[PDB]
Design a protein around this ligand. Sequence first.
Ligand SMILES: Cc1cc2nc3c(=O)[nH]c(=O)nc-3n(C[C@H](O)[C@H](O)[C@H](O)COP(=O)(O)O)c2cc1C
Ligand code: SF4
Lengths: 430, 56
Amino acid sequence: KTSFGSLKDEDRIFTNLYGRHDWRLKGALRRGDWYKTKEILLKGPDWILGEMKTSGLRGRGGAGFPTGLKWSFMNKPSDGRPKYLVVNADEGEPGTCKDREIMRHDPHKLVEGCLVGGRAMGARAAYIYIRGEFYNEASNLQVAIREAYEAGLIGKNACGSDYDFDVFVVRGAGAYICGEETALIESIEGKQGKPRLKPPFPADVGVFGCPTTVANVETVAVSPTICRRGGTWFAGFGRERNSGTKLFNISGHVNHPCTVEEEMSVPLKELIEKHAGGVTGGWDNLLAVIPGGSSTPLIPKSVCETVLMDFDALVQAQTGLGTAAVIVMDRSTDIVKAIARLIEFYKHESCGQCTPCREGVDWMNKVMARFVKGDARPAEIDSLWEISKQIEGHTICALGDGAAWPVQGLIRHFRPELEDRMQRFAQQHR
Amino acid sequence: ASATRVIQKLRNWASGQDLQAKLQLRYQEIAKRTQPPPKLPVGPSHKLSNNYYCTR
Ligand SMILES: Cc1cc2nc3c(=O)[nH]c(=O)nc-3n(C[C@H](O)[C@H](O)[C@H](O)COP(=O)(O)O)c2cc1C
Ligand code: SF4
C-alpha cells in the first residue's frame, strides 16, 4: 500500500468510541469483547508477546517505543517479587481526549487488555492510574470492573484459565507530570509525582520496587483485539514500522472538532478535511498545526500540505507523533500567544524536582510573555533557543524536552512574526 | 600670557625660540574640569547567544 486512510468500520477497533451503544458488560459482549480470552491466556505469555511483536505496535503514550519489546522486558522468571502492570490513564497532555473517551465508553476493552497484558508479562495485578479530574470515567471503570468480577472474568480464575489477576483503579490529584512513567509510579507509591531516574528501569525496579510496566490505555485496549485478530492484520494496517490504527483528537480552529479512529500514515490534510470538516475558513485560512499534542512542535501550512501522521513522517517533518492530538490554528490565531500559553502550562505543571526544567521553564515562560508583549530585542530569540537547547536532554524526564520543543518550533518557523512584533513595539515606544 | 610685548621680544631674542606660541603654563586650552557623563562600550563577550565560555 502507498496511500493510507479510509479506514473501514469493520476494521476499527474502538467500535463504541461515540457511546452510541451500551458500555456495560452486555454491550461489550455484543460488540465482541471477552471472546476466546481464556484461549489466549492458555496459549500463554510467549505467544502473546510474539503476536504483539509481529503486530509491530508502538506505544500510544507518546514516545512510541515498540510495545512487543517493552512488554517482553518482563519475560523473566520471578525473583520472589510480584510483578505489576500499570495503565497510564492520566492523559494530562493538552489536545488529547482519546483515553477519556475509551475509558468512559469502552471500559471492558481496557479491563480485557489489562488481563491480556498481565498474563503476557506475568503479573498478579494491573493498577490503572486514572486522572483525578475524571471522576465519572473512574466510576464507569469501577462499574465495568465490578461487572467483570461478578462474571468471573477477573479474580482468582481469569476466565477459567487458572490464572489469578486483580485490576485496581487509583485516582490522581491533578498533576500533568503524574502522567509520566516514573512519576506515575511514585504517585501510586504515595509520594509526590516526581520522576525517578533510569536505571533502574521499571521492568526491574518499578511500583513498590517490583518489576512493572506502565502502558497507555490505547495500547492496552488494542492489545486483546490484536491478539484475537492476529498481528499480521494490525501490521498490514499502516506503513512499515508505523502500523495499525490510531485515535486522533482534532481540536482548535476546525469546523467539527472531534475524536476519530483512523488508519495510520493518513495525510493530515485528508484527515482534517474528511473527519474535522476542514479548517474554519479553509485550508488557505490554515496557518499552523501542532500534530501530536503540546509536547511536539508546530508545523506551518506549507509542510502541512503533504505531511503524514507517522512517527517517522513527523520526525522527518522535525516533529513527533505523540498522543495524536491535532491542534489547528488559522490566520486569526495569535501564534506567539498560543505557544506562550503552552509554555505557561509547562511552567505550572513542571514538578520542580530538577534544576534545568524548573528554572529554565520558568525562564522560558517569562521570556515568552515578554515576546508576546514584544518587550525584547531580537538577540533574545537566539538566547531563548540556546536556553531551550540547554533544557532539552539534560532533564530527569522528558517534560523538559516537551517544553523546549514548542519554543524551538516557533523560533524555527514563525521567526519573522516575532521580529515584526518586536520592531513594532520598539517603534511605538520610540 | 600676560607678558608685555617688550618682555616677550626680550624673551624670544634671549632664548632664540618663539615662546608665546608654546607656553608651558596652561591658561584656557585645557579641558573643562566638569565633563559630560560618558557611556563606555561593552566588550565582544556581551552577547546573548553563541557565547559559551568553553569556546573562549
Ligand atoms: C511529562 C510527561 C507526561 C506524560 N503524560 C502521559 C499521559 O498522561 N498518558 C500517557 O499515556 N503517557 C504519558 N506520558 C508518556 C509516558 O512516558 C508513556 O505513556 C509511558 O511510558 C507508557 O508508554 P507507552 O506509550 O508504550 O504506553 C507522559 C510523558 C511525559 C514526559
Ligand atoms: S524535567 Fe521537570 S517535570 Fe521532569 S523531573 Fe525535572 S523538574 Fe520534574
